[PDB]
Structure 1
């Protein structure tokens, strides 16, 4: 664990930290400091990482309190899977009205990486079920899965697969826009609508390709991002990370 601290990884980078790894941060309203993985590039950009997938080592079918508090493992090398915790993500992303951007970074099973950036990304309080909001899609070759996707199953698909303004759901805390239970069916915790076009907390399928026959329910429950790959393609790695917007 590194010595420099601050309110986020950008604050840490601004204080002269140059190495990616584990740091304590203490956002404005945090009761106490907590550990994060900071990705610090050569340009002085310090990203605060709140989600990582890369090998299937952690089960992301976790309950409300587990998603709240965080699970998985932090590593100095950034080679482990984790969810930082909705409370922590809330505290970072809302502090001092600092405008954060979210970057989603995806890696396929062929060595290709793509990104999607969201401006003015915020996660609300537990009182509002950790609602996700953003101002706009700011670009990236992964495409804008949070806008929803035209799957073809029906003309309401896009409205029903968009993620802006969605509350967070777990199997034991259903806050989705479906009569059924998206989180329970797809085995994740996520900002579910009816149900999703982007789903980075989904089931880890080795090799990317899976199909309906692979799933117990018949729905796409993999690590999907529909604007980049078919719903039957599950990413090899994902990163969700935030930085003050001006660093874009």
Structure 2
């Protein structure tokens, strides 16, 4: 069933600009990347080439992974988008950070209620492995999900909103702590993200069947799950999630 189209390009866009039409798998080769790789495009009846790079769906693939895994990627790429996956930071970096044209992340979201919400972010980049794969956007650009990457006051602390701001964070996995915390953000949650101390957005969390949970759900008692406070409670993990990018002029 799973097939591969014969159209190449620099990003899911250049595919659609060349002739494409179908939400599926293709091979892209960004300027500075050495060998072409495989992405799940997402074309609508418009001409928009959405290079997707994250998904959650069911719980099959587990995101508690090491540095070299997130670096290179882990999971599977369905041409029906029915499979969870992480595309791999080196790829993100390579796609987004081609000059003369900035991208824009779209987080998409869904719940165990049927509701769907979006959130956008501008001039998107991921910094080299040198910079420990750093998240840098220009501005939140609107969407009924909300700017979670601009921190959030949760409980009692005053400057926890400063401590959960995500723009300007390096990637941190259990075996490569780059987060600003006395301990290891990646390990108390068992996942890999751009942690701070710790997070207001956490798309690579521990999936939960049903959605709602608490402290008693794990030995730790932490919020390891997939959360995004600007839209939902911290004790409710998403059913589905997404993260795609696109040349800005297409917005």
TM range (shorter): over 0.9
Instruction: Provide the secondary structure at the position in 1 that maps to 2:55.
Output: strand
1:215 deviates by: 2.3
Which of residues 156, 164, 167 is equivalent to 2:167? 164
1:147 deviates by: 0.5
How do 1:2-151 and structure 2 match up within 5 A? 2-151=5-154
Deviating beyond 4 angstroms after TM superposition, the runs of 4 or more aligned structure 1 residues are none
Please list every run of 5 or more consecutive structure 1 residues that lacks an aligned counterpart in the other structure. none
Mapped pair 1:188 → 2:191: yes
- For the aligned residues, what is the CA RMSD? 0.7
Q: Is the 8 A contact 1:37 1:49 kept in 2?
A: yes
Q: Note the alpha carbon deviations across 1:60-83, whole angstroms, 9 max, x for none.
A: 000000000000000111110110
1:153 deviates by: 3.0
Q: Note the alpha carbon deviations across 1:156-178, whole angstroms, 9 max, x for none.
A: 11110111000000010000011
Q: Is the 8 A contact 1:28 1:96 kept in 2?
A: no
Cα separation, 2, equivalents of 1:35 and 1:206 = 29
Q: Note the alpha carbon deviations across 1:196-221, whole angstroms, 9 max, x for none.
A: 00000000001110111112211111
1:247 deviates by: 1.3
Q: Note the alpha carbon deviations across 1:80-126, whole angstroms, 9 max, x for none.
A: 01100000000001012421000000111111111110000100000
Cα separation, 2, equivalents of 1:150 and 1:173 = 27
Range moving further from structure 2, 213-222 or 228-237: 213-222
Please list every run of 5 or more consecutive structure 2 residues that lacks an aligned counterpart in the other structure. none
Instruction: Provide the secondary structure at the position in 1 that maps to 2:130.
Output: helix
Instruction: Provide the secondary structure at the position in 1 that maps to 2:141.
Output: strand
Q: Is the 8 A contact 1:212 1:218 kept in 2?
A: yes
Cα separation, 1, equivalents of 2:222 and 2:145 = 22
Cα separation, 2, equivalents of 1:110 and 1:189 = 27
Instruction: Provide the secondary structure at the position in 1 that maps to 2:149.
Output: helix
Instruction: Provide the secondary structure at the position in 2 that maps to 1:46.
Output: coil
Range moving further from structure 2, 2-11 or 210-219: 210-219
Q: Is the 8 A contact 1:187 1:203 kept in 2?
A: yes
Cα separation, 2, equivalents of 1:215 and 1:108 = 21
Q: Which residue in the other structure is 1:233 paired with?
A: 236
Q: Note the alpha carbon deviations across 1:121-167, whole angstroms, 9 max, x for none.
A: 10000001100000000010000111011102301111101110000
Write 1 or 2 for the structure with the bigger share of helix. 1
Cα separation, 2, equivalents of 1:19 and 1:147 = 35
TM-score, length-scaled by structure 1: 0.99
1:56 deviates by: 0.5
Write 1 or 2 for the structure with the bigger share of strand. 1
Range moving further from structure 2, 199-208 or 94-103: 94-103
Range moving further from structure 2, 124-133 or 211-220: 211-220
